[PDB]
Amino acid sequence: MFEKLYSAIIYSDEFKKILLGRGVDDLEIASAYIAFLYEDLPIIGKNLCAAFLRMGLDAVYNVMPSGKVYSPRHKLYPISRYGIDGVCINCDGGKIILRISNKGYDPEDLLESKGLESRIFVSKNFKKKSMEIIEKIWDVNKIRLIARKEILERISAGGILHMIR
Amino acid sequence: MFEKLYSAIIYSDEFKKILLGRGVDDLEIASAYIAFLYEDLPIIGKNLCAAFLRMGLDAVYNVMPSGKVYSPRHKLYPISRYGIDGVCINCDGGKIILRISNKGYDPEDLLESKGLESRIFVSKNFKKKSMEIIEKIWDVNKIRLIARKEILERISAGGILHMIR
């Protein structure tokens, strides 16, 4: 049920290590959870995991150098433009601001949330909490190695330089 | 005695497929043969395979968007500059010019060459003849899969973006 969500989190993590040499952030993973709940909500800002959930490996062609994804067809925007009433992941534009708080949602608590709010907070260490949930259920190391090979196959279709461009 | 040369050819083929979505050309492979025979000769032009022979995996940090390598320390130049008396792979500068001829050297014959004409020629399908030799010695697929893992590992250190710069 959460298969599509957890896969997007592992795959986006692997691609970011290839692209920027580090893995996805607490809030980048949070954006995947938001995209999972609200399929037509625009995600603005640190939105890389949400991009993999909505676009799959095709997200690779729309990543900015910042690691933010621009693909309007999937309602993903690196910065806030006029009229996009979306969630701003770690930023102050859009209709809803999403940031980190002591008493913000844990991954499980966020999936049960039944409504959107003008401001949204996720707990600290959201990434660490979310990975532990996935590690229980899957052999994450085997999944990462498959993801790496599949991402590398994608990049090598037309090459690093064409894919960036 | 030829393992480092054949390895450089397979690794550079795999890296070029990641960088530009295609394999190495007949004369890019020939440039490694030349680097192998003449360790101090500057190599100008289509020179990627020579770069891996001389720099190993460090060649990935010095590739131009043309797939030509710039590393003065390793006598590798993408274009001919004043006083660089080197072999020009597929170009007309330097002191020696290397191109394809219907009568040009085969890989075995080139390895047996004992001096340096003002105009060297390699035969057509030099890449095919070279790949056909290497494939009689190793399971090339095992090499490619290792080269991929190690190239990707190198790229992911600082990420694709920092590497091509």
Numbering used by the authors:
A (entry chain A), B (entry chain B): 1 to 165
Task: Quote the study on this structure.
The segC (sso0033) gene encodes a 165-residue hypothetical protein of unknown function. SegC has a tertiary structure folding similar to those of the ThDP-binding fold superfamily, but SegC shares only 5–15% sequence identity with those proteins.
To this end, we determined the crystal structure of SegC at 2.8 Å resolution. The monomer structure of SegC exhibits a compact spherical shape consisting of eight α-helices and a five-stranded parallel β-sheet. In addition, the electrostatic surface potential on one side of SegC reveals two positively-charged grooves, which might play a key role in the DNA-binding ability of SegC. In the asymmetric unit, SegC forms a tetramer composed of two types of dimers, i.e. AB and AB'. All four monomers exhibit an almost identical conformation, with the root mean square deviation (r.m.s.d.) ranging from 0.20 to 0.25 Å (in Cα). The buried surfaces within dimer AB and dimer AB' are 713.4 and 497.4 Å2, respectively (Interface-1 and Interface-2 of Figure 2D, respectively). We also noticed that two SegC tetramers can assemble into an octamer from two adjacent asymmetric units.
